[PDB]
């Protein structure tokens, strides 16, 4: 939801074309009294309480909460035997069928999330195989998130990624309350 | 719009067995978008309902209503249609099984009134439906007689139980 923007919008009685004049005198006609043909009671009239977009849903959970969520997702995967640690993501070939057959033989779920340490240094073989697949998705370590982890039945992390994740997530437990955004220089951050 | 009445003359029954009885022929026919009121047409369709083909044609020939000349025209072409297409031997051996009218598609027009007022008049149209059946007209039901009234009354006195007990 945080990045959701709804573009739904309707016209109120003020924005519907026309509708200036009183359609007929207040009294004497025997009809119901009306002030405008564009009232929400009329066919073609304005919408009383319709969507008034564009509408933003932005909000931010506390940084510590979002970090804890990642920890929970990793634990759940390990506790349920859905986490596999690899030394590297190098395949012998770039054929997607190899990777598909490998998952079937090792009894991995239908979908597998592949997490590499860095986008630039992803092996070319795994890049070729995953690029041609739909349920086998390759992401960098910076892309790890709860939604992707839950959507994919199996999570595969490289050993360098494991070190990367522990460093970033445990920093949240031992850190001071900030004095200014962490993008600015600190004594001991980054690394 | 619905046009099911014209599709009833296309039903093909399986051949009958040697022992089964002769099946009467049924002929469905109608006329659509007649410039006439269905309420006024209903009195004419009710008149010939149950009559023979030759008796209905005689009653409609001396009626002064406009719908009479139309129904009679629909009956004459349904009679010929029966013998020519539906394998009816005698053209007089037909009677009116069903005959009713239906509302057609109508048009709306303005009727000017005084004081700048107006009404909307419908230009009325109707349908006429008829079903012919081969054979003589079924004999009319005799009026209930005193013997039947008494026989029914005594039957109710014999069917009454002791209520709200064992």
């Amino acid at each position: 939801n945080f990045k959701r923007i709804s573009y739904a919008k309707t016209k109120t009685r003020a924005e519907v074309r026309g509708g200036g004049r009183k359609p007929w005198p207040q009294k004497g006609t025997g009809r119901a009294r009306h002030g405008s043909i564009r009232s929400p009671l009329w066919r073609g009239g304005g919408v009383a309480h319709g969507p008034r977009g564009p509408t933003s849903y932005y909000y931010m959970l506390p940084m510590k909460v979002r970090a804890l969520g990642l920890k929970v997702a990793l634990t759940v995967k390990l506790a349920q035997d859905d986490l596999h640690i690899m030394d590297s993501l190098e395949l012998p070939t770039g054929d997607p069928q190899y990777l598909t057959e490998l998952a079937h033989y090792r009894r991995w779920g239908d979908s597998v999330l592949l997490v590499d340490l860095t986008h630039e240094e992803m092996p070319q073989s795994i890049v070729e195989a995953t690029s041609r697949l739909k349920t086998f998705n390759l992401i960098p370590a910076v892309g790890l998130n709860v939604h992707s982890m839950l959507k994919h039945q199996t999570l595969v992390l490289t050993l360098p990624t494991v070190a990367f994740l522990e460093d970033k997530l445990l920093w949240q437990d031992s850190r001071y309350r900030p004095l200014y955004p962490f993008s600015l220089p600190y004594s001991d951050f980054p690394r | 719009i619905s046009r099911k009445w014209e599709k009833k003359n296309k039903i093909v029954y399986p051949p009958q067995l040697p022992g089964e009885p002769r099946r009467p022929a049924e002929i469905y026919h109608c006329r659509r978008q007649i410039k006439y009121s269905k309420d006024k047409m209903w009195y004419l369709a009710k008149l010939i309902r149950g009559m023979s083909i030759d008796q209905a044609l005689a009653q409609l020939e001396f009626n002064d209503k406009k719908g009479a000349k139309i129904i009679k025209e629909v009956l004459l072409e349904a009679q010929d249609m029966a013998v020519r297409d539906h394998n009816v031997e005698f053209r007089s051996n037909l009677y009116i099984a069903e005959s009713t009218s239906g509302r057609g598609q109508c048009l709306k027009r303005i009727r000017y009134h005084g004081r700048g007022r107006f009404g909307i008049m419908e230009k009325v149209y109707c349908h006429y439906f008829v079903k012919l059946v081969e054979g003589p007209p079924p004999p009319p039901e005799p009026p209930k007689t005193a013997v039947a009234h008494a026989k029914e009354y005594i039957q109710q006195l014999r069917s009454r139980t002791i209520v709200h007990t064992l």
């Binding site: 007929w24 005198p25 009294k27 004497g28 | 598609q105 048009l107 709306k108 303005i110």
Partner: peptide, 20 residues
């Protein structure tokens, strides 16, 4: 008592002009 007159309003013509 002030004169009260309600003028008549004609409906749109097209509503009574449609043909088959």
């Amino acid at each position: 008592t002030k004169k009260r007159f309600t003028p008549p309003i004609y409906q749109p013509k097209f509503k009574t002009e449609k043909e088959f």
